[PDB]
């Protein structure tokens, strides 16, 4: 019975809180993102991850636990909110997944340069028009420094950034401090819209071949 303004703001706040909770809980399991769909007397939450076996667990025990805790914490009516785990298509095109993969590689003792180059190569071989990986923090010395790896196309200004660029930021807790990892992936135009924006770049003009 609350006003529309407060209703929409609460919906956004719930989405943000659920995203943060899932990110904290499903860190190692991989968590690309979540989507909330509202239906009459039913709300659907879809978890996107690169490893849905871990998210579901054995016989869906983990997903059932997550559904129960979400329902109890968010005051949802019982048997009204259900969770689903879905594969992420082209995980190499998801900035969050690549950032988590780089975090896992770095936490495993892999050299920063090798891990970043591998991530760049995997992203490029996955159909990305371009990518950029930045590693910041105390590397090899007590003095912090930044490492930048880049290949392919990249835009940084104007409206098309919000659709043609997928970016993520993650922190890695190392022994001597925090490491900052930024992943920025430039998508490619997709007429279907499944793998990229369904809109061409503003300054791209195509002339049909004459008969």
């Amino acid at each position: 019975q609350i006003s529309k303004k407060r209703k929409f703001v609460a919906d956004g706040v719930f989405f943000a809180e659920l995203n943060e909770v899932l990110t904290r809980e499903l860190a190692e399991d991989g968590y690309s993102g979540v989507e909330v769909r509202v239906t009459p007397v039913r709300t659907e939450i879809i978890i996107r991850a690169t490893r849905t076996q871990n998210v579901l667990g054995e016989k869906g025990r983990r997903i059932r636990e997550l559904t129960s805790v979400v329902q109890k914490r968010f005051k949802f009516k019982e048997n009204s909110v259900e969770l689903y785990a879905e594969k992420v298509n082209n995980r190499g095109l998801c900035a969050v997944a690549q950032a988590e993969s780089l975090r896992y590689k770095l936490l495993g003792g892999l050299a920063v340069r090798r891990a970043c180059y591998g991530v760049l190569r995997f992203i490029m071989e996955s159909g990305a028009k371009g990518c950029e990986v930045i590693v910041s923090g105390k590397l090899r010395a007590q003095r912090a420094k930044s490492m930048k790896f880049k290949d392919g196309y990249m835009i940084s200004s104007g409206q098309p950034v919000k659709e043609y660029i997928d970016s993520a930021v993650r922190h890695i807790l190392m022994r001597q401090g925090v490491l900052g990892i930024k992943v920025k992936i430039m998508l490619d135009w997709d007429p279907k819209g499944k793998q990229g924006p369904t809109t061409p770049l503003p300054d791209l003009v195509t002339i049909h071949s004459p008969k």
Binding site: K5, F8, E35
Partner: protein, 102 residues
């Protein structure tokens, strides 16, 4: 068995809201029902202006954050069952549909 059924649609995305309104209107028309609207209420623009810096240093720069809420009103002259059937059509996420009488 005829009543003025009021349908209120609210969404943050203009395209989805307009498509849902068009679908509802076409569904009502296909049943030879009388449709009034959709009426577009003035857009609600929630605005928050917060300082960019997480501290007090530097030139005081501000971020203007807006959240736009679009509301539509549709009136149908028919029974409850037919409007309930019409509204059963698939609705995309982000669009809230409320059905009432008068």
């Amino acid at each position: 068995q005829i009543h003025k059924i009021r349908i209120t649609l609210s969404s943050k995305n203009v395209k989805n809201l307009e498509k849902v309104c068009a679908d509802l209107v076409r569904g009502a028309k296909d049943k030879r029902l009388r449709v009034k609207g959709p009426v577009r209420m003035p857009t609600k623009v929630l605005n928050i202006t917060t300082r960019k810096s997480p501290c007090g240093e530097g030139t005081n720069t501000w971020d203007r954050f807006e959240l736009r809420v679009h509301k539509r009103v549709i009136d149908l002259f028919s029974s409850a069952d037919v409007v309930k059937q019409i509204t059963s059509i698939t609705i995309e996420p982000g669009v809230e549909v409320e059905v009432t009488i008068a």
